[PDB]
Every structure is written in C-alpha cells, then in structure tokens.
Design a protein around this ligand. Sequence first.
Ligand SMILES: Nc1ncnc2c1ncn2[C@@H]1O[C@H](COP(=O)(O)OP(=O)(O)CP(=O)(O)O)[C@@H](O)[C@H]1O
Ligand SMILES: Nc1ncnc2c1ncn2[C@@H]1O[C@H](COP(=O)(O)OP(=O)(O)CP(=O)(O)O)[C@@H](O)[C@H]1O
Ligand SMILES: [Cl-]
Ligand SMILES: [Mg+2]
Ligand SMILES: [Mg+2]
Ligand SMILES: [Mg+2]
Ligand SMILES: [Mg+2]
Ligand code: NA
Ligand code: NA
Ligand code: NA
Lengths: 389, 389
Amino acid sequence: TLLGTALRPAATRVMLLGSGELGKEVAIECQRLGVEVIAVDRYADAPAMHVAHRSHVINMLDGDALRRVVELEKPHYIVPEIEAIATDMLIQLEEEGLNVVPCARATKLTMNREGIRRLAAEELQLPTSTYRFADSESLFREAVADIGYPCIVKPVMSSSGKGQTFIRSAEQLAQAWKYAQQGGRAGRVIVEGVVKFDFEITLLTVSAVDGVHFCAPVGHRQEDGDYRESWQPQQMSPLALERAQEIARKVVLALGGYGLFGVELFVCGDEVIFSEVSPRPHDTGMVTLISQDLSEFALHVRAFLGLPVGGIRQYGPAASAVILPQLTSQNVTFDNVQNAVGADLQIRLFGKPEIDGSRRLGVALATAESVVDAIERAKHAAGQVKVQG
Amino acid sequence: TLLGTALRPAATRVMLLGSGELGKEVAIECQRLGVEVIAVDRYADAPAMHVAHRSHVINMLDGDALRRVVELEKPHYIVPEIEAIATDMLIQLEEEGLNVVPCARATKLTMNREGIRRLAAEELQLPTSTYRFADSESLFREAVADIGYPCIVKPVMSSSGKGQTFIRSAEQLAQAWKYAQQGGRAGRVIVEGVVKFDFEITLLTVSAVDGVHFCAPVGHRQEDGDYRESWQPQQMSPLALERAQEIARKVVLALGGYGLFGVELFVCGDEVIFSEVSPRPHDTGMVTLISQDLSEFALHVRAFLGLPVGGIRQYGPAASAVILPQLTSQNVTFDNVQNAVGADLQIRLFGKPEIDGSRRLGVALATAESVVDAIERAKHAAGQVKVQG
Ligand SMILES: Nc1ncnc2c1ncn2[C@@H]1O[C@H](COP(=O)(O)OP(=O)(O)CP(=O)(O)O)[C@@H](O)[C@H]1O
Ligand SMILES: Nc1ncnc2c1ncn2[C@@H]1O[C@H](COP(=O)(O)OP(=O)(O)CP(=O)(O)O)[C@@H](O)[C@H]1O
Ligand SMILES: [Cl-]
Ligand SMILES: [Mg+2]
Ligand SMILES: [Mg+2]
Ligand SMILES: [Mg+2]
Ligand SMILES: [Mg+2]
Ligand code: NA
Ligand code: NA
Ligand code: NA
C-alpha cells in the first residue's frame, strides 16, 4: 500500500458519493492518513463537504453527471454513502478501471431487495423472513394472502422504511399498494412475513486483506423508520453469536470487495435470521465512535485502502442516541450543550445547513459500567440539547 | 453554552493561528461539533487547512495583518498553535472583545523564555533549573561562569531545540554563542544549569469551567530538538505525581483562561522541576490520539468552548513514535503502509506539502500490555513506512 500526499501530484484520491454524517467520519479518517478527499452530494454544504478538500453538488442518480465528476477528479476510490446512486454507471466505471468500494456488484445487489434477498435465501441458503415479490396489486393482494398477517410490504427500491407498510388488516391494501408505488422510484414490491425476534443487531463486519473480522454485536431501537439508540455489545448466546458470524461472513464474501459491511439480523433465542446488509458503514455503528479503538469509519478506510485490520478492541458497555429534532430552519443553533458532555460522554453535531421536518442533526455517545446505563447516559445527553430554529 | 451551525449565520467561528498537525486535530475536533474553522498559517496547504472551512496565508507576526484577517473573518475564538505570533495585537484584540485561547497574556508570557521562566521561578516560586539571561557574547560568558558546567544555552525565542548547545566546557563557548545567534528573531539567550532527572514528562493539564483536570503523565524521549517517542502512562511515585499536579495547576491558573496546556517537567525520584509549558496541545501528547477517550485536541476544544471536561479515560499502555524522514521533495509518498498498521497499531500522515531536510511527516501509534512493548511496536511501525519523494 502506497499513499501519496493530499494536494500533491502523487496524492491518493477518494471520492465520496454521499456526504452525510457517515461520510463525514470517513472523510475524517481519510484526512488522518493525508488522503485527498472529494465530497459529492445533491446539496451544498453537506456534512462531509465541511471536512473534504473540495466538493461537488450533482444529481448522483444521473449516470452522465456521475461519469463527468469522476472523470474530472480521477479518484482512486469511489465510496458511496447511500443506495441512491446510478449504480449502473458504477459498474461501467469499475469495468473501465475505477475502484468502487467495496465493489460495484455489491452496490447493485444491495440497492434492490430482490437481488439481495434471493442471494441470501436462495443462493446462500440462509435464514430469512418468509417473503414474496409482486409486480401488481392483484399479485400484491395475492402475495399478502400467501404471507398472511401481519406482514410487511416494501418497495424493492426502499430505505429508512420509505414507501413501506406494516400490515395486520386487509383494509390497508389500497393505501399500502399506493404507498409502495409512491416511495422508492415512483413499481415492484416485496411482502415479508413478520419475524418475532428477541432483539435486532447490526453485525459490523470488515472484509480486508487479512480476512474478515467482526465488531461486537450492536443492538438498536428503531422507531418510525429511524434508529433511536444503539448499544454494544448486545448480549447474545455464544451459539447465537457464532451463527450470526457465519451468516455475516457468507454474505460479505458473497457480495465481495474490501470494506466494512452492516449485516442486519434478528435474534430469537439461539436462532439468527438474516434481514439485509449495507455495503458500507451503518448508522447504528455510530456507537463505535466511542466504543472501539477503531471506529466503523476507520475500519472502512483501513479495509478499502488494502491495509490489514488485525483486531478490534471494544471498550465496554457503550451507546449512541440520536439528536432528531423536528422543525423548519436554515440557521439551527444548539443550546445547553454543557449538559450534554462530561465524563464518558460526547456529542457530535453534523453541520447540516437546514432542516424542514424530522432530521438527524447530531448524536450523543456514552460509555458506562452496564449497557443499560450507557443507553440512559446517551439518551439523557441527547435530550439535554436544546435545538433552536 | 450555545453553538451555531458552521456556515450558517449563527455559526460559531474559530480561527487557528498556525495550521500544523496539532492544529489539524483541533480543526477535526471543532468540525465534529459543527464549529466553523478558518485556518491561518505562513504557507499554503498546511495540514489544518486541509480540514478547514476556509484558509488564509499571512505574516502572523505582523500585527496589522493579523488584525486584517480577524476583521475579515470575525472569529469568536483565536487559537494559536505556535509561539511566533503578534502577541501585542492579540492583547489588543482580546481587549476589543476577542476570545484568545487560552488568553492573550498566556501567549505573551510564553512566546519567549524570559516571560515564562521569570514568572514560574520568580513570581510563582516553582522549582526550576538555575538560569541566567544574556544579550551579549560577553554577558553570555559571564553567565556561563556563574551557572557553571555543564550548562545549556538557548535562544529566548525558539522551539524544537533550535540553536541550543549542551555546553560541557569553555572550548565550546564561541561556537555555542554563534549557533545561538542563528536561532530566532535573527539576540538574547538563556543559560540554564543542567538538571539531572530520572526522566521527563509532559503533564497535559486542562483548565475548564469545571476545574483543572490532568491526563495521566506522558513520558518522552528527545533527540536533537525533537521528541522521538512518547508513551503513557509514565510511572511515577505518588508523591511525585502530586507535586507535578500542584505545579501544573499553579502554572495554568497563573497563565489564565480555559484550554489544555502541556506542562514540561523533570522528575528526580519524588522531586519535580518545572521546565516550560505550551499554552495549548503539545506534540508529545499525540499519544492521546490512541490512549484516551478524549484526545488532547478534543480536550482543548471542549475546554475553550466553555464546556465541562467531566473526566478523562485512559485505555492502558500506549506510545507514539514519529515519522521523521530526511529529504527534499514537494511530492512525498509513503509505501509499505500495510506493514505499519494492524492490531493495536495505527498511523497518521499529516498532509505536509513539502520537505527540505528533516521534518515530522506523520506519527505511528500503538497500545500494548506495557509502555515498553507499546514503544517498540510504535517505533517499529514508524520505521516500516517507506518515505520517498
Ligand atoms: N420481516 C421483518 N420482520 C420484523 N421486523 C422487520 C422486518 N423487516 C423490517 N423490520 C423492521 O423494520 C426495520 C427497517 O426494515 P428495513 O431494514 O427493511 O428498512 P430500510 O431498508 O427501508 C431502511 P434501511 O436500509 O436504512 O435499514 C428493521 O430494522 C426491523 O426493525
Ligand atoms: N536545564 C535543563 N536541564 C536538562 N535537560 C534540559 C534542560 N533544558 C532542556 N533540557 C532537555 O532538552 C529538551 C528540550 O528543551 P526545551 O524544551 O527547553 O527546548 P524547546 O523549547 O526549544 C523545544 P520545544 O518548545 O519544541 O519543546 C528537554 O525536553 C530536555 O530533554
Ligand atoms: Cl538573569
Ligand atoms: Mg435497507
Ligand atoms: Mg434496515
Ligand atoms: Mg519550548
Ligand atoms: Mg520543550
Ligand atoms: Na472495490
Ligand atoms: Na475545506
Ligand atoms: Na480571551
């Protein structure tokens, strides 16, 4: 592994496709290695752009635009932060010699539930929820019938729960089907049975030159399509853990390429069920900013740059809790910060330029003697911040 | 404590006066809190500028230049990274209402050995080496005669051991004096008696809204004006730690304002002697980038923003080892990186645009079960890096 000096002729260049808070930490980790960072997004002053050498605002869904910026910048690495990109163009660029992290195929299978679902369930022969795909309401109706209640319906092109519906009753069908055609692209869906699990975890799995290494399991609480709190390590049976790792390894190896992956699983006793996987750092993993020697962002960079991980140290019970206010403003200020920091307690404020509704503006990070106390410490701190408009 | 959003009208603005690798970390920590950063230095593309919202290049010693930039950017805080700055203007500006970190007086006192030495030794009555100042070759000779051999002569305005001579005999008098005239303002020198200590430490002390806090003692190895390796914690007797803390507390308070200070001390069994102090993060403190929950940079930022520290977590034995090559290039590259990182092993590459001789271009960091093992690991890693240019 040879690294140049950022801004110099031999500089090593990383292009970030998506400049949110996750991308912001990757940018930081690149900067720490004197790696040149070019932050791209669909709006100005995105968080990662604050810490990049330079940036561009483009429609990442537009492959011609993608090609143009890439060609312009000639990056050594293309690192997507989100699903919403012209992956077809990534495939092309990769085919043309670009290094897409972790690999372009990985980004495509994952942006489509069908792709990934089939791979895991069928190909990989892995445990997942019951499901069915449908191209028409009739089929939709048909499928919901085959799956039963309650059930979940999601566009094969959905995230943050966008265009999805929890179904317990036939009465929702008109709206459900409509919600589904609504989000994502705006027309195919998936109908999954509902899993009754003890808890959900994110198994942050890094695939690098020295193989696959795992972070301790991250548990989390989802609400209204948003994670609220995350903690580590989530208590699980040795057997359960063992099964989760097997699943994670099979999946990452199957997707291919080096990087950090967020493997979403469900746990019921010693039983583990595959849900889905992010081919990049996961929001829940923000707890690793205080819980490990190497954060999920640092692991991602280490891996993609072709460097060995060796090991991951975990510093005891830890937690993250989001700062998710809801208002409309283009000049947000944060008060009472002094009551959100202290021993074993930190906060991050993203730099987002504006808000117009519910948006993640920061996160609180805490460690404690117990996971339960870590959670409370983090929640309480997030709650002390007064978000003004 | 109220923080705005970087780039927004209510943004909290921090101006860095000196954009080296230490300032780089300060910038990253500011950015983590959505603080707006303006990086200033005497050359372009300086490390901190890589992660700042905006950058300027001026003569920081020029008081008028300083006022101009300050007027132009209107920062809430001015954070100097070096001694060589227009201290008189900082005083002016602080009066005109600007928050100079930690305070303007602290900067004035420490820009030259005379202010700080006389304050510590005469005003505060802290134990220090014997010393005499001299502004002429002849006064220089009279000083040596009084101080005795061996002694160390140093220019009053210097750093990183520039223009210093360890004088063992009169043979060296002529050269010593010449070499001393070479370093600084290019005049006045300090002649100090030689302290025979068991070891030296850097006691990273934080003066904050909630009091004075101390990081575990940092030991270090100096070689030709430059620290080479640093480690933490450095073992010391209880009595020595307490005397070191009393000294550090006294000095920071006397200097005034909130921030992290690097108190340089010589330890002689249970006795502690004051050497000097950086009214800001110290290079030897880079070990904290791996050894604590909050690095010395995160701590400085937390303190100067008026937030409480609460407490500092130390993760066990750790060390830092510099990457200090020698060459002339404007396009430095680093190879063999895959052999300089791994389990409990990291590196940082500063992004310095060029080198023309010996310059610290990065640092290796490691943790282990003992400071001895950490030091070895970190030195080995620094060594694995193939610097070419
Ligand atoms: N079959 C299933 N059974 C039980 N809960 C399910 C489920 N599918 C989804 N969930 C719940 O809903 C959450 C979000 O589901 P999903 O991961 O499919 O959404 P998403 O793809 O739209 C968002 P993201 O990509 O950001 O994770 C899960 O983390 C889980 O809490
Ligand atoms: N009186 C004294 N007796 C014994 N050793 C001394 C000494 N003064 C300095 N030293 C040794 O020399 C080193 C550098 O001295 P000093 O810190 O004063 O130089 P400096 O101010 O130019 C460097 P910097 O500001 O970068 O730390 C010390 O860290 C110590 O090893
Ligand atoms: Cl004197
Ligand atoms: Mg998903
Ligand atoms: Mg999900
Ligand atoms: Mg000094
Ligand atoms: Mg010194
Ligand atoms: Na790849
Ligand atoms: Na910038
Ligand atoms: Na001030």
